[PDB]
Design goal:
Four copies of one chain form a homotetramer. By secondary structure, chain A is an alpha+beta fold. The first copy, chain A, has 13 helices and 14 strands. In chain A, the strands form three sheets. In chain A, strands 1, 2, 3, 4, 5, 10, 11, 12, 13 and 14 form a ten-stranded mixed β-sheet that branches. Chain A has a two-stranded antiparallel ribbon with strand order 6-7. Chain A has a two-stranded antiparallel ribbon with strand order 8-9. In chain A, helix 1 (about 30-40) packs across helix 2 (about 65-75). Chain D: It catalyses: 2 acetyl-CoA = acetoacetyl-CoA + CoA.
Chain lengths: ~400, ~375, ~375, ~375
Amino acid sequence: NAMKDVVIVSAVRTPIGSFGGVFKNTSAVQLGTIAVKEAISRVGLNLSEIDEVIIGNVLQTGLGQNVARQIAINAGIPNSVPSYTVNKLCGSGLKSVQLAAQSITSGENDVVIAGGTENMSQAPYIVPTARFGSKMGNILTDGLIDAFNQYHMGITAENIATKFEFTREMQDKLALESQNKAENAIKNNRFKEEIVPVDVLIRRGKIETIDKDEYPKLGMTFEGLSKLKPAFKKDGTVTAGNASGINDGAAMLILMSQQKADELGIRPLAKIKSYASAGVEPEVMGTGPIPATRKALKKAGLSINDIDLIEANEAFAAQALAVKNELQIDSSKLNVNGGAIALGHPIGASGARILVTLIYEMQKRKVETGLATLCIGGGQGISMVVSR
Amino acid sequence: AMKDVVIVSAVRTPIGSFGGVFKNTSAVQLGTIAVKEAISRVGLNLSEIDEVIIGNVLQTGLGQNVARQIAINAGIPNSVPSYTVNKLCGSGLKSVQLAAQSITSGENDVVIAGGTENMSQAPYIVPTARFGSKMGTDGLIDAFNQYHMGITAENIATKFEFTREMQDKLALESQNKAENAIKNNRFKEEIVPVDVLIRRGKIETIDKDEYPKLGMTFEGLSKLKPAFKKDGTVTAGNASGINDGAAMLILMSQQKADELGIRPLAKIKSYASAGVEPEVMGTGPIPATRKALKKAGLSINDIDLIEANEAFAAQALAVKNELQIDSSKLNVNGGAIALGHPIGASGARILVTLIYEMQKRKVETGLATLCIGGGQGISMVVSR
Amino acid sequence: AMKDVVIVSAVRTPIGSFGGVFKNTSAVQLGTIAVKEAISRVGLNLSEIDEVIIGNVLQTGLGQNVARQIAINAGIPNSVPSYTVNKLCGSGLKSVQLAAQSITSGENDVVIAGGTENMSQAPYIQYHMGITAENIATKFEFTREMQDKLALESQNKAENAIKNNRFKEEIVPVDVLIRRGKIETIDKDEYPKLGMTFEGLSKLKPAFKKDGTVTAGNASGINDGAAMLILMSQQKADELGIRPLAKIKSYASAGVEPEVMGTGPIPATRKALKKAGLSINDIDLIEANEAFAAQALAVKNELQIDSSKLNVNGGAIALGHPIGASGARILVTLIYEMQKRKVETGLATLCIGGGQGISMVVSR
Amino acid sequence: NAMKDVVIVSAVRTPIGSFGGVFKNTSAVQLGTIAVKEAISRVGLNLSEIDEVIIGNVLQTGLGQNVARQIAINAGIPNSVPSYTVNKLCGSGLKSVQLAAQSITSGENDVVIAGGTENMSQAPYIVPYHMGITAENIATKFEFTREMQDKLALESQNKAENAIKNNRFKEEIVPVDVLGKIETIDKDEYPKLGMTFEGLSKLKPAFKKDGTVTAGNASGINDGAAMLILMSQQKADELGIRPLAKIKSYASAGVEPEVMGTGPIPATRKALKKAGLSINDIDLIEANEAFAAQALAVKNELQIDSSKLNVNGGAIALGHPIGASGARILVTLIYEMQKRKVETGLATLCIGGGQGISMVVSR
């Protein structure tokens, strides 16, 4: 029995909203439903062809909630189809894609919808504290709740900065360039193809169509970033300016076996070449994408020079610098349309979001090979190589 | 204001530790147990009940009426209105006050009042916006607002020059008082034992308060580190805890009690509330008590027993000293430092404890007082 | 002896629509404006205020007290106790009830009560209530057409009232900042839809159920606004030389059976009338809050209310429903209209949770 | 390319402890670690051969918690090895094995540790249950009386008692040491000996007034772990390790809203279809018994022979540590297939109220 090739035939993302911003009233289920219906519609896919739905989401109102199933139902997918919600923190959205591909290669499914969604704006009001944050004193601080685990992650980033010797200036420079790259991409409408617009109510009797990312900060300067106060550690280097934000958004892809796509007459946007995940030593927590990527590259028989475009999620500039330096990624190939520092980081979605952004840019540049990588827990990373 | 209001029944569950004996017994269950026992003890007909007013702070959301859930669970008719009071620390005593004024108004003849809280379960079912407050150390959530109140306590300690040693001495007295009370089964009359159930199968029976630290010595407190300020004076040993429990009282007009052949445990003589200046946050019980005493036509020397809730030794010292309360009249069976502080229940709990002790001692007058928010206090005078 | 309770001052801000005129005017600011104006209208000295009780639903902070912040902002001494009432839709009327209770008990002589809400500024914001309405519609057999025509009539009355500046006496204007250095005064409600028609209502899609009858057109919206009243004992009002606007005759609250959820105003009103020794026919004007036409039909029909006596200047379906404030808002509206019509007896009633209702009878 | 066959070469479980019972002080991590070390030790597996660890758990899945990874670290597995905690409610433990199998078939991994662990004693039980009502609705919908449910529960107890009397679980259990005296726990705690139909009929309904579901015809709240080691057939041959069983097929499926809780029915039909088998070809079935009402529906609709079903007792008797049960029933199936020397087995349970998962294995 032969192993199947998995292709991506459709891929879309909502704009990314700021915390308490445009999507404050548009739930994670709504955002996911919009992206799923659009993914399906763009390729005219019959709902009866969908075998499974696997969707990343981190912040749920309790045990027993299946956000993926709610979305699939809202999208009109038959109740007989199984849906699974993936909570793997930072990497949920890319892990969902990986799980979908495995299920195709195993012969279990021919057509799988995969992605991620998150609404972090709504979480403080509907998510129980035990699922919304972690306790401090995990190191006074103890007895305090760390919203979204942001403080624990920032300390991890500070520790990376210390061990790898990344200064405040170096981190701010990367952050500035992320913003520069997003601003130029948005000026050139680079995201037009991948974005599904989202309608919101801004006032009674008035609907606005949101088709632009909210989080990028226009006209940022190095001087401005230099003025910001440390966010997590006194005399630290990590600030709100060189870290990503708290954000809302969704991203969805449709996967098929090459054979199924052919049968349906649907042309692939990309092919999945390899993927891998890996753990790290506790001395370098947060550096997961490095061994994962080396492992995925080795599986594909490729080196980093063979990769035309890289998307490495930018939760923190400190961590982004480590990934870039240890993998020897050329500045010109990395997060070319901006990274999460500019674009935002809706946690359950980002892994899928960066894959969407990657595929559309590979297509625009007519390049052959790309890579998406990010954390999947503080101690682990996941990486996926795709080809056109 | 012609109707005289009496308390005819008063009961409380044991108070459980955080994640302790009641981690599987919700605020609704605890409150239902207390309500059913309070009714049962005086043989009250369920049709006599006109209203239910119950304190509770930590809720899964808006639109939740914990009081009504308890009333329904207790078999009280659906036509009876029920209200949940969320006024923080003071909710259980404010509920009694509201019940009393609804009787004096002529609106009601019989009202069930009290409070219930399960803080152990709260992290798992209460959204973060309702579970805690933001710090500023910013973007960090202060669970149960304990850090904010701890800092308020430190500021009182600074303002009034209450040393670490003075706070620990009060805390020690509280612990030792609770221990001796428990050794003498002092709370037996007021406690309703709680059967822990899983799918209506009994796993255990709780009839003793879990939180007191038996055999406490002064050195046991002096060895602890500050909890809120580096080089501060407030510790986990001289502040109360996070706790689970319920307490319920039944109020009636005197005429109604007489008609029903039910002897009062106590009469409510006065109550009052008051705000404080921002420089002395957390000191609410002081002006509230002075106000309530003036309404009763009494002075502090006319009061035989006082229950002033002990959230922080620092704050308790201020209340004791500013009101000039004889230490031997204050929290005589132990205070919240030893017994625990289930926030929605405590105001009603201390009133229950006060009433039974007045009766055992056969004295005439008592008062109960505590905060109703950082900026406010509430106080109630009762007589036997 | 029991104190008789009077209302000596009553004011409401305009009602703003969602994301409308008051999007940058918080529940506290709206509340403070209404409170300051209620005080100045009768020239009341700040030292006479004994307590402040204010309804509010959406400021759910642990340890947050909007009523006290409002009191502080209005220059009321910090020694005065203030309480925020969260009782959902009944909050603003419950506040007045608690105020009255504390005066009759002898605790207080002068109490400020009301409600305030800014639903625009809610970080996260009707589903279950909507289903409850859909269930009432089923049980009492109220059709889409029946609900839409009630909505239409509510709009008509509001249009008529506003055309005749009916709300001029009761409204306190609110200054808002449009840009740096430039403020604009809002003195008119924003939510009424002018010229809405039957055919326009009939085309709307059901809001909750797939084949349901409740829509955005026959239910209220979400809104921003505040309303404040000053209550005194009659004796106190005399000593200060302030004439009552109204006298509180009775009030009551009641629960309902699970089958009839959302019908709380019905037994609550019957109870209050019974305490007043009155019948529905003795009441000249009735304000029953209109969150849903389906439930408004139930209240109207079961209480056998003459439609010419009910919500005569429009109900919430037309005027808006700032939840923590509505209970107080309708009482304010009821009082001023009683004065204009020179009638003697009025009644306000609304839900206080899905399972309960509250009702109050006033006289002039 | 070529698709690899997945075999199970090691399989173990802890005893299942009662709520507040023997494992009151033994965490999901501790139970899980014990099960992993023993599974590894039993086949003399070099730690450097392990490619991935996938472990079910429900109650310890808070932000930034990774129970599987802590377990791997405690078991001495290199830190470079990725570990994943699966939270899929009741199906977590079987879903983990399924995910392990797919990662081997994909060529991603050669050796994967999979299973589940749960300590429900150390978690809060909050009621002021959703499963219990689903069960009542199944009872109503399918017309299962109180008496029918209790009859099933009693048979489950009787089968468990028979198996324990014959030391049936001896091969599959790893003993757990608990506390200054140290007692080795080597027997399941939860079965109720001397169980009678009458004693069952005396219990009160647990979820609904005049309900049929009780604490006696529903499974308990329990503590335990179960772990398995999966390899490609090629990798097993290379290491010289003989398989206990081979994974033939698996599948999952959603249900219609009217029949919530019946997931195992369409999931099993789907898995049998993929295997090229009918129910009558299956020699032994383990279908998890969360509620008698639900087990009755599964058994009837799939037309399962009672003499082949949960032959050593089901969860009503043995206990239901939720994140572990999916793995636990597979371990129990595999050992009993080997004792009876039969060829084909099926394990199935819910994975959410709306879904089920099933796996067919052969010997």
